[PDB]
Design a protein around this ligand. Structure first.
Ligand code: BGC
Ligand code: BGC
Ligand code: BGC
Ligand code: MG
Ligand code: MG
Lengths: 720, 721
């Protein structure tokens, strides 16, 4: 419908209707719900909610199905005074029913299109089940793998996360101006604003602190790219940002989000994050929490009642302008409009779209794009279809391969490693073991299965509940039984491939040392076993690269490729000296660096002549010719980094600024060109200006952060 | 001499002498030294230095003795156009020749007098050997025990570090206006400005980053307290502060240090820190390093030559005002003047008499017994009867490496090891010494034999000092693994076990506490370690130290500290076991041992007098504490008072230490102490960098650690005093 009819709706709304429009609730607090009606009475009492509240609530979160939504919406509209329909939101994080690889794994794809297709298939399926908005992408920069939520990020690089973030928004929303028409597309909600992934010591919900310059330089960019790409909503974060809970942080949400980033959509609190400003000790009670959160431009409170119980009194007492509320309601109604709910409150409600063969194939291709081959000694992999396999370990038969933040996908639809492998390989013998134990009986069985076979596939992993939200690990290791199992299997004299399943970087040196190959599958989602089989057999050729550094040990954290030089860099020419930046007990380098990944193919790259000089404001075009010098078809991820050698601020040794995954047949050669605009050469200075300084830059072209050729360019002269 | 002549001296110096005055060199680069003269020619040449340079250099660091100094100063004065003497600086960090406990152990003393005595003794001995300045106190807040340099700090509390830092300055300098009169006193140099201990991942020299509010709230106070207490010098830090190396950080050094902190003394670069801004990538060459460093107000370049090879060109070309140079030189000459070096360039110099005396040694012992921390003592194993038969086993049994890191002048041959220490007090001791990093089958047979005979094991475990200090970073804060196996083995021998731990950082000690009956943390006590150990074990001294740094559950809990924020989902005893709260799946949130924790052989009872329920803004809270030793044994308790601001415009720490006093109490004896928490103690830096006091609720915690406390509420409001 048209904007004046919206604007009118705000004017026609009572104060209480407006307040309640600023409330989001779980599906089973509404009448009409097809599930959990036995939780409804106790919780409605606990939250002190009325029919008046629930009949005028803005939004539902976490409906279980199309029937739940239809049911809640049909009933809500029966008794809603103005017929303002409900907006329905869900966690569609890396798939709805067809589960794709976890987002950290998607990061390792280095493949924008894989990311977009994931998001599109997710939207197609979720819209089919009645949801209007997904709480995705998660755009928190992560340098600390203790934190469970690293599984949700695409890793430690702001540029990669910004690029994959846009791919996700594009995937979920298509053309955002047509969301009222493209009812297979849905609204994306960027989270968590801001800097949540810098949680101190990897401890969930823990303190975050960085200078404002680092916030802008490294922590803000991906949120901003997703916003500029059209993301419809933003969610606040649980953490303090410079002492102040993001949720009630006026500078962050008014000056930065709405001011500088020009975001004019709905800001939704994370779960109870409004009431929780009370725990953080920046509000004395719900009245202050509501006041401060509303001043900050938080439009929709998720599952708490500070607003519904306090906004009226604050407005009536003059402590809070009713203009702020009206602005909030307006943003709510606009989102409903943009979604086309005023014409179809059921947004086209499609079962035939859910869990298709086509989608499953796509999730599988996503899996094979995302896995990272870390070791492959003496060409153990790929295996011949007739290698006799002993498949052992806790991930041999576990159905837990879909990953964390899988709210809707079902393990019964998933394909386990045993099933995947039996499809491909004639002889497979399987000994399954527990996640956290290694019994004598186990060892006897393993020995018996390995004696018979020619290769061990040693499938190790985390349970997914050891990560995700409030899944913090102080020590980033598998249970010790898994390392002992790898130590044991290794003594059996047969070649060993470790298929690792997990949601975070782990200490994997003892795994790499005890095996001939190491394949990092993360959690591939619904087609895990097949993803695994194809890669093992060579039907697919591994092509993923690490989007997050694998530390030598827990105590190296944080370690990350784009680091400062320090005043005493360890060089190769001073290594061994005492007074340089180093540790007594481990290398400075991570066990595996950012951008690292092996292939069954072999490539060579060639960078065309670059200019020696460039003007300020001018783009650097980088041309790369790549050839597959092997007999095997494969993909390579070309990466381009830049360093600013000297600057008014100490600048990272390398920053990723472009990348492209290139598919190549045997013998085949392609050419790609990259534009590094002058923005790539820019940075925030001590005064928070985005600036470009004349001076020397190094450009690195290669296939990891360490496998690169270096070139120099002098920037100066005039500005374009 | 008169300010007026100092002034004149500046007008009378050439440009080249003015520049050289801002250079600091090792002794063996000067004519007249009596050690290492064979390094002089190669190094003078590598640094491109000339007679003109060295003959006019401002300063020496690291002279080896009184004779070194006298030789060098004699030669320099003979050839120096205007007779401007050298100022001689050294690292006198926790003692000169009488080695005292490492500063982290001194922090555990929670004892201001102990710290001042340490410094006074240090100053006595060092002035005796010709040194004018000490590069001490080290006032870097630490939360990361991976970092080697935690040994040099007094811990994770800004208030403790501020208090003790003042005590150090007082001890070294006494009356800072009389340093030209009191020649057994010396100039202190606060370091490292600023925030160097926050190095990322405990990696040496590594990136530091925090919001400016946190800089002010937690990282700056101790530097400021020492400066306000009259520290004569300040040294820059190696790290970036908000992206910019501290040494060329104009805001940090001109605006904060000289502006807000009113510091008008000599600002000395850390070692090579001026040239190293080039490595940090904020200066293209020595010319830029020198310019940016002089703009930032660095007066004295330690052992690099940017200023020396570049200041002239910068000044000549108009890139840099000569007035800055004049200002730097004036501060250099003022310091020399304050040290009385224009009247007496040899600063009172035969004083061997004063070095390593018996009285000083007792002082260091007392410091050691003040600083050790008793962590476990199950069923009163300690103190031991003098007739107890002791199996003394481990790498610290006989190691002479007990003086600690940052001991540049102390000699292990004067130190007392644990064996010698114990043989003085206990009649029966059998000793099985083992290596730091190994445990052989042969060792185990030998340990088994010694333990079967004796009544108790004194299992002495520890770090080499080289595993800490500068560029001694450990990713994993653990002893070598052989030592944990030795503890584990020894526990199976059926006899009671005390572990005497010697180290320079918090370590993972849960396996040590679990494998023994008592655990005594000695850190590195210094020259008298053996005796410090014996007196505490035997009960001639009663342990009384408290932890000034949290001991983590495991390496990956780092950073963990008592003065932490609540978060939005604090783990409470009511929500325990719930999934969605701030917690780890694999460890507790609490450190294994918390700040302010320490056991005693005595036992104490505290009661806080009634506190007002309400307070005006600007008003002090007087806190009166009656403490009673209720046991038969004489001892000290450390009373501790913390404050929390329950609600504020910034999320505030759940607790902050605001006062403390160590109280000596004879058996049965009772005392009353009172503390004033001024309104500054209720104040904090707000998002706009204002120090503010906000009306509202506080909690006051009175007790004997950060966790053993009674809690009281006070409402602040109304009007302002
Ligand atoms: O599921 C609702 C929301 O729950 C919160 O606890 C998480 O922080 C969000 O990422 C999530 O979207
Ligand atoms: O030195 C760089 C600095 O610039 C100053 O102008 C600001 O106050 C600081 O907060 C920032 O860290
Ligand atoms: O000895 C001169 C100086 O050496 C530097 O490496 C240290 O950082 C200082 O703390 C010390 O004072
Ligand atoms: Mg530059
Ligand atoms: Mg308050």
């Amino acid at each position: 419908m048209e904007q004046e009819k919206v604007q009118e709706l705000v004017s026609q709304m009572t104060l209480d209707e407006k307040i309640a429009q600023c409330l989001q609730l779980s599906p089973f607090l509404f009448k009409g719900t097809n599930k959990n009606a036995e939780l409804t009475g106790p919780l409605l009492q606990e939250m002190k909610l009325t029919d008046a509240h629930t009949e005028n609530a803005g939004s539902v979160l976490g409906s279980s199905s199309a029937l739940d939504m239809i049911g809640i919406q049909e009933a809500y509209l029966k008794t809603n005074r103005l017929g303002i329909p409900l907006v329905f939101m869900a966690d569609v994080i890396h798939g709805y029913k067809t589960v794709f690889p976890i987002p950290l794994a998607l990061g390792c794809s280095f493949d924008r299109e894989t990311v977009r297709v994931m998001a599109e298939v997710s939207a197609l399926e979720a819209t089919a089940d009645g949801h209007h908005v997904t709480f995705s992408p998660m755009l928190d920069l992560v340098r600390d793998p203790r934190w469970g939520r690293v599984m949700e990020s695409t890793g430690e690089d702001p540029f990669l996360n910004s690029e994959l973030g846009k791919a996700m928004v594009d995937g979920y929303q298509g053309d955002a101006s047509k969301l009222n028409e493209n009812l297979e597309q849905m609204a994306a909600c960027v989270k968590h604003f801001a800097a949540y992934g810098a949680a101190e010591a990897g401890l969930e919900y823990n303190t975050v602190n960085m200078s404002t310059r680092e916030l802008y330089q490294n922590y803000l960019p991906a949120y901003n790219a997703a916003i500029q790409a059209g993301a419809k909503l933003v969610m606040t974060a649980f953490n303090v940002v410079d002492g102040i809970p993001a949720t009630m942080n006026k500078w962050l949400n008014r000056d930065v989000l709405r001011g500088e980033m020009e975001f004019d959509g709905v800001l939704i609190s994370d779960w109870g994050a409004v009431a929780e400003v009370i725990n953080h000790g920046t509000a004395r009670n719900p009245k202050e929490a509501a006041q401060f959160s509303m001043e900050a431009g938080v439009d929709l409170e998720m599952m708490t009642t500070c607003y519904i119980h306090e906004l009226k009194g604050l407005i009536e007492e003059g402590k809070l302008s009713e203009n702020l509320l009206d602005e909030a309601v307006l943003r709510m109604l606009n989102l409903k409009n943009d979604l086309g709910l005023f014409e179809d409150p059921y947004r086209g409600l499609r079962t035939k779209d859910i869990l298709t063969d086509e989608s499953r194939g796509k999730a599988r291709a996503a899996g094979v794009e995302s896995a990272v081959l870390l070791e492959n000694k003496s060409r153990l992999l790929p295996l011949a279809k007739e290698a006799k396999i002993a498949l052992v370990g806790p991930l041999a038969t576990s159905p837990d391969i879909l990953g964390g933040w899988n709210v809707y996908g079902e393990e019964k639809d998933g394909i386990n490693v045993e099933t995947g492998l039996r499809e491909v390989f004639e002889t497979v013998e399987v000994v399954s073991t527990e996640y956290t134990e290694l019994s004598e009986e186990d060892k006897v069985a393993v020995k018996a299965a390995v004696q018979n076979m020619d290769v061990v596939v040693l499938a190790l992993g985390e349970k997914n509940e050891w990560g995700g939200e409030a899944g913090s690990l102080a020590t980033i290791r598998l249970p010790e039984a898994q390392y002992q199992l790898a130590k044991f299997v290794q003594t059996l004299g047969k070649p060993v491939v470790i298929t690792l399943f997990n949601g975070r970087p782990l200490e994997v040196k003892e795994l790499a040392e005890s095996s001939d190959a190491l394949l990092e599958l993360w959690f591939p989602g619904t087609e895990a076993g097949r993803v695994t089989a194809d890669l093992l057999s060579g039907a697919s050729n591994p092509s993923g690269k690490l989007s997050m550094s694998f530390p030598q040990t827990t105590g190296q954290i944080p370690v990350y490729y784009n680091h400062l030089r320090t005043g005493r860099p360890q060089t190769p020419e001073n290594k061994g000296e005492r007074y340089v930046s180093h540790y007594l007990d481990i290398p400075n380098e991570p066990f595996y660096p950012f951008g690292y990944g092996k292939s069954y193919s072999e490539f060579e790259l060639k960078t065309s002549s670059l200019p020696k000089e460039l003007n300020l404001g001018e783009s650097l075009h980088v041309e790369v010719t790549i050839k597959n010098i092997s007999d095997i078809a494969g993909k390579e991820v070309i990466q381009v980094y830049l360093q600013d050698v000297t600057a008014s601020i100490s600048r990272p040794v390398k920053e990723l600024k472009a990348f492209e995954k290139v598919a190549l047949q045997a013998g085949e050669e392609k050419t790609v060109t990259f534009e590094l605009t002058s923005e790539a050469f820019s940075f925030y200075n001590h005064q928070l200006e985005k600036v470009q300084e004349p001076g020397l830059h190094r450009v690195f072209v290669g296939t990891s952060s360490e496998d690169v050729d270096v070139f120099e360019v002098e920037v100066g002269g005039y500005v374009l």
